[PDB]
Symmetry: C3
Subunit: 159 residues, 3 copies
């Protein structure tokens, strides 16, 4: 039976994974390609965690850790940015922002699916949350590397 | 708490805003880039309207007006087109059509969110409706500027 | 009245149709462009089937047949591939995978819409299911034609 919470969650993961594959094909920098390729493998691990109630794979803090550390490294390169950043700029940053918004849609759906499947590993939602911040940091670096300035809808805070 | 109607509406606005950022990065014409960049700022204003029950920003008829006037200008350039237009053609028109279909998805979701949040400013749904027609008109002009003919699934009407 | 199951189904078909239009604009091979252009026309026929309770157009086995036969031809060219394929590679295969994941989202939604509209022609869901496999086969051929190797998250089976 389809349309189930599990099938839909796996479907959302695949959609996100496919946009990531598209971002990788449009980004020329090896550091970002390497990081994103690791995320794709881990999205498959997340799917196996979900599909086997954490029996075959179990997402834990180390997965989340790596996302946070890479996020810190990209931000070190881009430097501080005013919030909010209007998504866009270089085609590389633009595709990363699209991918980021899809990751956020999967994150919201995951919270909803957890209501129907309380057994879902909570670390999965944390991973998804950290992933969107990593994608955001990568988009900032993409524009910097492309000599493109960030467009801001200024709310008075910076990151 | 996430998964709420407000958080989901804001998430949909961000996804649309990100596709618009992607369309801008793929379009070489300054008139379209200028118009789309204004829409991105206004999507942030729409988000603030929603988030503050129209206290900090309030979408009104003038926002919608500008969308309609620009729509008329693009259509003046493309001339009449038979309906239905099969989405595609130049990469520029194709990305505009994708963006248009996402705007329509946000518009439908907005109608659904209004059921859970009757306080939402109705002008927001009107803005979203006009935006998809503007994106459609821009896609027609994009193909014309690219010497690409529109593909038609003819229903006997023209616009 | 919007937000209805019919309006949402038609909206999902349009979103899928628009991504297909985008994939066509990014693919240089005439065989794939021809096949995808036929799918776009048929998505409009599916919309008319839905909108007229199969009165004006009626999706039947021959539609599905053509999808399966073309799928077999692309697979003959790509040869066998290990599963699971991590979506991505060439920009052509990447956009095809994104389109494939959207087709799968429309397929899942269709199952849900059928619950609210039991009159929907069941062959429509079958068509959507076959379409995602065709898109998958095309993505394999796209990478082969681009000298790009498939990335695999190996589950021990091949197709």
């Amino acid at each position: 039976g389809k349309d189930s919470p599990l099938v839909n969650f796996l479907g959302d993961l695949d959609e996100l994974n496919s946009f990531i594959g598209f971002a990788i094909s449009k980004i020329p920098w090896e550091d970002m390609k390497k990081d994103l390729e690791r995320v794709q493998v881990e999205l498959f691990e997340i799917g196996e965690d979900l599909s086997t109630q954490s029996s075959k794979k179990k997402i834990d803090e180390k997965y989340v850790k790596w996302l946070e550390e890479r996020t810190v490294e990209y931000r070190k390169e881009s430097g501080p940015v005013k919030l909010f950043v209007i998504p866009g700029g270089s085609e590389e940053a633009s595709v990363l922002h699209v991918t980021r918004s899809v990751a956020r849609r999967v994150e919201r759906n995951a919270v909803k699916y957890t209501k129907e499947l309380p057994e879902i590993n909570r670390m999965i939602i944390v991973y998804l949350n950290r992933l969107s911040s990593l994608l955001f940091a990568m988009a900032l670096v993409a524009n910097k590397r492309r000599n493109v300035s960030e467009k801001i809808y200024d709310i008075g805070k910076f990151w």
